[PDB]
Amino acid sequence: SPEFAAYKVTLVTPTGNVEFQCPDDVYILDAAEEEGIDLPFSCRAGSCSSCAGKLKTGSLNQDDQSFLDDDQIDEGWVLTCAAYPVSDVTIETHKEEELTA
Ligand code: FES
């Protein structure tokens, strides 16, 4: 494993695609906000639905999230405030309304 790495993050938002580099040790949401991007959030701690998105391409680490159950992780759900990229990723944002619980 490299000590450090950078990953291309593409966010498909309701109003456009936005893209940015994200370090291996920076959450999706923080890397987006570093580039002026407006995403939904609240707790910023991985324990709610505000920042939910759907993984479309690549792989994510979500050790730091606690709200999504294993079934939801297997459905492609992502808490963008608690997810690190481990590859180039594409994520559809603003998806909280699709969650059941
Ligand atoms: S804002 Fe609450 S889990 Fe991300």
Residue numbers in the entry: -3 to 97
Per the authors:
We first selected spinach ferredoxin I (FdI) and incorporated CNF close to the [2Fe–2S] cluster. Mutation of Tyr in position 37 (Y37) gave protein variants with equivalent UV–visible spectra and cluster reduction potentials to the WT FdI, while variants at other sites gave abnormal spectral features. Therefore, site 37 was selected for site‐specific replacement with CNF, to generate the FdI variant ‘Y37CNF’. The Y37CNF FdI also exhibited a UV–visible spectrum and reduction potential indistinguishable from the WT protein. The IR spectra of Y37CNF FdI in the as‐isolated state in solution show a low‐intensity but clear nitrile stretching band at 2236.2 cm−1 (top) close to that of free CNF measured in the same buffer solution (2237 cm−1). Crystal structures of WT FdI and variant Y37CNF were solved at near‐atomic resolution for both oxidized and reduced states of the protein. Superposition of the structures confirms that the cluster environment is well‐preserved in the CNF‐modified protein, and is unaltered by redox state. Site‐specific replacement of tyrosine with CNF causes a small change in conformation of the side chain relative to the native enzyme. This shift is sufficient to alter the crystal packing, placing the CNF side chain in a slightly different environment within the lattice relative to the native Tyr, however, comparison of the structures of oxidized and reduced Y37CNF FdI demonstrates that the redox state of Fe does not influence the geometry of the side chain relative to the [2Fe–2S] cluster position.
